[PDB]
Design a protein around this ligand. Sequence first.
Ligand code: LPP
Ligand code: LPP
Lengths: 98, 98, 262, 262, 257, 258
Amino acid sequence: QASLREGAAGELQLAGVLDYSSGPALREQGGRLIRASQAAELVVDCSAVERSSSVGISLLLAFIRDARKAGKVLSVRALPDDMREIAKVSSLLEILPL
Amino acid sequence: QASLREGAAGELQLAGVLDYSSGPALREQGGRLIRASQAAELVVDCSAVERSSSVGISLLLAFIRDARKAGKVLSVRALPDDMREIAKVSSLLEILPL
Amino acid sequence: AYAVELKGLTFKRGSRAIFDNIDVRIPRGKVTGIMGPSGCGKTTLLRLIASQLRPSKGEVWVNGQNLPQLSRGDLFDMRKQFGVLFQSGALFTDLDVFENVAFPLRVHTQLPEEMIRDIVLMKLQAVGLRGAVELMPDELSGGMKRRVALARAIALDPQILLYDEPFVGQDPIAMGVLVRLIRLLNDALGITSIVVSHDLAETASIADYIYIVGDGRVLGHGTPDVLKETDDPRIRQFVKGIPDGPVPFHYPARDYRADLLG
Amino acid sequence: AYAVELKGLTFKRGSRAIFDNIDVRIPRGKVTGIMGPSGCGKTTLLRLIASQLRPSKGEVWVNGQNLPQLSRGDLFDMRKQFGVLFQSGALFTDLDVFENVAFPLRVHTQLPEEMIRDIVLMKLQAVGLRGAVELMPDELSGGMKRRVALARAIALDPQILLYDEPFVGQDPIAMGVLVRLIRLLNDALGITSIVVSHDLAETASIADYIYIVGDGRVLGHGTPDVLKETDDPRIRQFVKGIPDGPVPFHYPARDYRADLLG
Amino acid sequence: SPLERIRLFGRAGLDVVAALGRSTLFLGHALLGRRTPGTGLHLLVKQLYSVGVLSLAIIVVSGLFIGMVLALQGYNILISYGSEQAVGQMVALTLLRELGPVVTGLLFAGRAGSALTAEIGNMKATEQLSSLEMIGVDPLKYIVAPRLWAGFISMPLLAAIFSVVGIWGGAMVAVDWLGVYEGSFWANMQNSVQFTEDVLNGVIKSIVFAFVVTWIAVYQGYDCETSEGISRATTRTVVYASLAVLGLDFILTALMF
Amino acid sequence: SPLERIRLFGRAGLDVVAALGRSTLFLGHALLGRRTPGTGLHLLVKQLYSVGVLSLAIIVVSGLFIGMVLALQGYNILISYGSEQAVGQMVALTLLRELGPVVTGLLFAGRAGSALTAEIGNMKATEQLSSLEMIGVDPLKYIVAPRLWAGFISMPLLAAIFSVVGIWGGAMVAVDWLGVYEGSFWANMQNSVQFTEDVLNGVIKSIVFAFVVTWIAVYQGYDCEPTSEGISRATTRTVVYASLAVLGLDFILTALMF
Ligand SMILES: CCCCCCCCCCCCCCCC(=O)OC[C@H](COP(=O)(O)O)OC(=O)CCCCCCCCCCCCCCC
Ligand SMILES: CCCCCCCCCCCCCCCC(=O)OC[C@H](COP(=O)(O)O)OC(=O)CCCCCCCCCCCCCCC
């Protein structure tokens, strides 16, 4: 359903539906195959994200737990308001930086 | 403790505190002894009742079950306040002839 | 002048300090209440003033002579003064409803088995359950299984009576009759009542001198409306919803960043 | 449209007629609440919309298509749409808290074990009970043994989630935190919530379109205010105390004068 | 952690040796404390109906089945010894000397060693017992003392009925389908049974783990916590009572072969 | 009413066969229905620990006790005849073909015949067994199927362990407490048991109960009415019915092979 492109050299973009099915596949194809480049300060722009849920939050959340491992830093920009709600529900407000 | 007298002419008196102690004593001493010697209209008067519990009402309700066996009609006069309340809770106000 | 006076009671169960130096006075004729958070020992403070449990130190003063300083043959006579209505009924599954309600009478009193029927009935027509005088507590519905227990309690015509969690977990059409009965018994008969339940709204609606118990000590006491604006942090957290306050809403986790990122 | 619709539904247990031609229409996004007297089987209406019990006849439009007319290959996928919350938690005693909240993830979804950890933690966080991610359900007090079950429910982000008498039998604190949690859930996530609890005094606050269920049929429906003045005898007897009414207060005794004398 | 596991094992070892103490004090308070105001013989009769008369349909059929098993087996192991007539002196020895009295323990402690602890634990959980002290009646001598007296005087009768039905079943199957001469069967049986060393021995052997089965069936229910507490206490009493049937069987038969 | 008394008796009698049919339907749906998502072998392992390994102490102490009882009893009975040197044949014959599986039935149906019923009963009555249907995991193939498969393959092993410990603890009293020739004990033992006629016979007799004890110990727990008393009554119905089934099916399975 969703895809991960434009990475390994800068801004890494997201696709629309981050459901439970597209969870592990997107994670794997983004977890290392994109992050391991060590190119610059990665920006993950979730612009064209139509629908998502907590699986998407953990996806964005697993996205950083390896940057913390790989030394580089990344932050999310244009976080969609639905995932904004899913995060605001839990005490997670600034644990995910933006 | 208790007492019971004034038979064969109505005006069936009753003494003070009627508890579990004075229950069966008065119950028997009025059940058959007094009841036999009686004539019609059987006025029972619990005037000098210092205090009484529901055993007192049961006793006053033991005078009705045998008056129906004895045939003599009966009614209760000078009913106290405590017995009044113990009756009002069980709503057997009409059950006791006044 | 008060019905139940607790002079410096203290209770511990295996060095637990379930109650430390508590001193509560219950006013005669007034339907008081006691309550508190989950597990503050209200149930124990009940069995304590009823001499089902022995106070480690202190004394429960009831209607004059204090209970735990008497002979068995005397405390047994004092048992005529108070009954107890436990939630979930506490009905004797062996005996039918009639013998069930007559049980406290067949113990303290040797009365004619024809006179006991009158007391049972008049004490069951009051609580309403004069019909199923022959059913078994196994068959009584979960609702009326408690009103017959109340009938058993008000047998012997006690002077005080205790209520363990009466209006908790029942439809309002049954909690309605139960609270009406708890207020009627106090008003009509003029007998003390000690409601022990954490149904805040209802207890505050019925109780006269409500006390609150928390984690081993008396958390103040007074009339209901007074405790609604006492501003005691724990008490104002209790008597309102206000999920967070002195009692922590969160569990002692390690760190929201650590447990998630490491 | 609507979340749950039961057009012309009924159900019986060995010719007992638990529900006869009943009908309920649940609005998506709002916290509807059904309730009724002791023994109307509200919980039985709960499990119907959850496809735990098969309806005798009717159809249950849950989030669109009806449930009892689906293959298991699609009903099992529709199970992802809704959770539940039974009182006393209904926690798996075999699994500690972490697996207890990860269980719905370890069934419908095949996610990397580390993603399950992040999801469960961010879920146990919202429900507060995050610290005891390694405790066992027997170690958890009855107050927090329910919030962890709620966390299990809200896993997978269900679009609707039922509640089986959540706030019944707990202090005003552990009930306040739970009602705050269901409020935060429905309001923020924008997910339906069907509070099936006979305790009206508390539900009337958190009810948007509260229903009533009794004697096996839909006993009116509306917002809490319009049911406080419903003018329906049985329903006005329910929504307030008023012990005696269409539901009796006494038992069908033969006669008081009969039993007392003869 | 090893040290904490050893601490917990020592704690359990102190508990079990303290539980026996608490159980003995409870039995003492139950059997000869005082005369409670509400007691009588009607309680003993009622609990004798729940303990014994309801446990008749289990041990009678058990006696029948184990009797035909004992006969149909010994005859097979004796068909090669030539003494197929000693079957009588077997189904009246094994089913009397050891297996008949023991199986009545393993079974009475399953029907009335478990139902007893459930009925006397659910009482503690539904507040029944705690609501008995407020009425003034001693719960031990009203609720548990009739259980003890209905277990003491109904397990020996159960064992006697079990042995009688087992002997008769072994007869019925030894004569009908096995064709053994009924005359020689009953003859050898009546001859080599030695009342004073087998019948009374089985009876005292049954009284021992009657006193010890009803004791730990009643106590384990007077000392349980909740439905999960009772659902575990009934398993605990079934296990402890089967263990105290077999162990007391060994200890007693060692004192009198 | 006497006529209504007979009505109630016939009602209970028909209820028994109705429940038996419901139980075999439940067993069918449990053993071979379908592979549910939550199912796995770890379930079987956990239950094998909850059913068998916890039931090892009871069955082993029982084996030792019942073995020394069997020996110390037969030695007395054989003393009068003079063939005491064959006591080893006796215990290995009774405690291996009749008293072994029967007592381990009466005992495995006591601990794991009541623990199982009370456990899955308390499951049913705390909605833990119903809340599994909402998640989609069929409870049969998750809650009871590992119980059934941990009763089928843990009662025969329990019976083998029980018979082994009973034989050894019979030797331990015939030899080092009553003084017979240990070599004679073991030798006369292994000449008159005929494995294919007694050992495998006892193993089959134990398997048949293993199937019929863990089936009426998990059904009676999946069928108890959901309360704190229905469960305390089911954990007695299951002990009664399982002891009765052990005894009856052992009678059958020994009349089928003497
Ligand atoms: C002719 C002589 C008369 C016979 C006299 C009868 C003796 C009575 C003794 C019975 C002891 C039981 C006390 C009550 C137990 C209780 O309720 O106490 C119950 C507690 C339970 O505590 P928990 O709460 O921790 O589970 O402990 C037990 O479970 C005890 C287990 C009972 C086992 C008894 C077996 C005794 C024989 C052992 C064999 C010895 C081995 C040697 C072999 C080489
Ligand atoms: C001389 C004639 C006398 C002989 C009589 C013969 C008796 C035969 C034995 C009886 C059986 C006892 C069972 C008691 C259970 C009960 O009553 O049943 C009672 C319960 C219902 O009772 P409730 O009312 O509590 O629901 O039913 C069940 O639990 C259902 C399961 C019972 C299983 C029956 C045994 C099945 C046999 C399978 C053998 C094949 C195995 C091979 C597989 C490899």
